[PDB]
C-alpha cells in the first residue's frame, strides 16, 4: 500500500508561475482521494466529469497534477469553456475535461511586505493557447506594424507581467495556489485506481 504523493504536490514550498505551470504525472500507486475532499483547507473545489466520492472506486491509467499560483479573480477563468487572459494565453482547460480543480488561499505563504514579483503570467501572446499546452518562450510581443527586432520599444512589450501579491491586498488580488487534477483512462492498463 504505497500511497500516491498527493502531499508532495499540494504541500510544496515552491509553486511554478502561471506561464510555465508545473505538471506532475502520478501513476502506479494507491491514490487516496478522501483526504482531498475531507479537508476544509481548500477554498475552492470543482470537479468536472467525475464525482469525488466515486473517485475511490474508479480506476485511471494516469493522473496529471498542474500547480500554479494565480490571483483570486483569475481562479474563475481557469475552467472548461471559460474565457480569460489566463485561460487564453497561460493555462488552457479542454471543454471535454474530466478532473478536479482545487484552489486554496496562499496569502500568508506567498506575500511579503515588499511584494512577491517572482510569479509571472503571459499578458500577450500571438494566439490563444490550445488545451494542456505550455508556452515558456520569452520573446518580445509585436503589436504595431514595425518589427520589434528583439528590442523593447513603443508597441513592443515583454509578455511576462509580475504579480504584486502584497499582504494587505484584497481577496481578489491575494495569491491563490491552484492544483488541477486530470484523470486519463485512454491508456489500456489502469494503475492508480484508489484505496
Amino acid at each position, epitope marked *: 500500500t504505497n500511497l500516491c504523493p498527493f502531499g508532495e504536490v499540494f504541500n510544496a514550498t515552491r509553486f511554478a508561475s502561471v506561464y510555465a505551470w508545473n505538471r506532475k504525472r502520478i501513476s502506479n500507486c494507491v491514490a487516496d482521494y478522501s483526504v482531498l475532499y475531507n479537508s476544509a483547507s481548500f477554498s475552492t473545489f470543482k470537479c*468536472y*466529469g467525475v464525482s469525488p466520492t466515486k473517485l475511490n472506486d474508479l480506476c485511471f491509467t494516469n493522473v496529471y497534477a498542474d500547480s500554479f499560483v494565480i490571483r483570486g479573480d483569475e481562479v474563475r477563468q481557469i475552467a472548461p469553456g471559460q474565457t480569460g487572459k489566463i485561460a487564453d494565453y497561460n493555462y488552457k482547460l479542454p471543454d471535454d475535461f474530466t478532473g478536479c480543480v482545487i484552489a486554496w488561499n496562499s496569502n500568508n505563504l506567498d506575500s511579503k511586505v515588499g511584494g512577491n514579483y517572482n510569479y509571472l503570467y503571459r499578458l500577450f501572446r500571438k494566439s490563444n493557447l490550445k488545451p494542456f499546452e505550455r508556452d515558456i518562450s520569452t520573446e518580445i510581443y509585436q503589436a504595431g506594424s514595425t518589427p520589434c527586432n528583439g528590442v523593447e520599444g513603443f508597441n513592443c512589450y515583454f509578455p511576462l507581467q509580475s504579480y504584486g501579491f502584497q499582504p494587505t491586498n484584497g481577496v481578489g488580488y491575494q495569491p491563490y495556489r491552484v492544483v488541477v487534477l486530470s484523470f486519463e483512462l485512454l491508456h489500456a492498463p489502469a494503475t492508480v485506481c484508489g484505496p
Partner: nanobody
Amino acid sequence: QVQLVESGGGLVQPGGSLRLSCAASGFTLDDYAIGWFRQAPGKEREGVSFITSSDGSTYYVDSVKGRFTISRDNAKNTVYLQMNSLTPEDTAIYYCAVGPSFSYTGSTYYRSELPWDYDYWGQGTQVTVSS
C-alpha cells in the same frame, strides 16, 4: 431572466435561530449550484454554505459548520439557509448565488468561496446579532 429574492433577516439576540430564504425564478433550482455568501462591512463576500452537487450534497465552512444548515425546496423553488446559535461575529449581509448549472456543464461537484466564480447574484439581506 434569472431573479433572486431574499427573505428573512433582522435583529436577533445572541444564540438566536434565524431562517433565510432565497427565492428562485426563471431557472430550475436543482440544476444550478446554490452558494450562500456572507459580506462583512468593508470586506469581500465570503462563502458560508454551498450546494456542492445536484444530488443535494452540501459543504459548510468550518466557522459555520453545524450551526448553519442549507436546504433546497424544489416545490416552492426556494433555497433555505437555517442559522442557529447565532453570534455577534455573524452580523453581515447575506447573499444567494445561482452558480453554474450542473446539466449544462460537466460539473458534478461545485463549491467556491470566491464571489466571481458564481454566475448570478441576488440583493443582500442584512442580519444583525447584537447582545
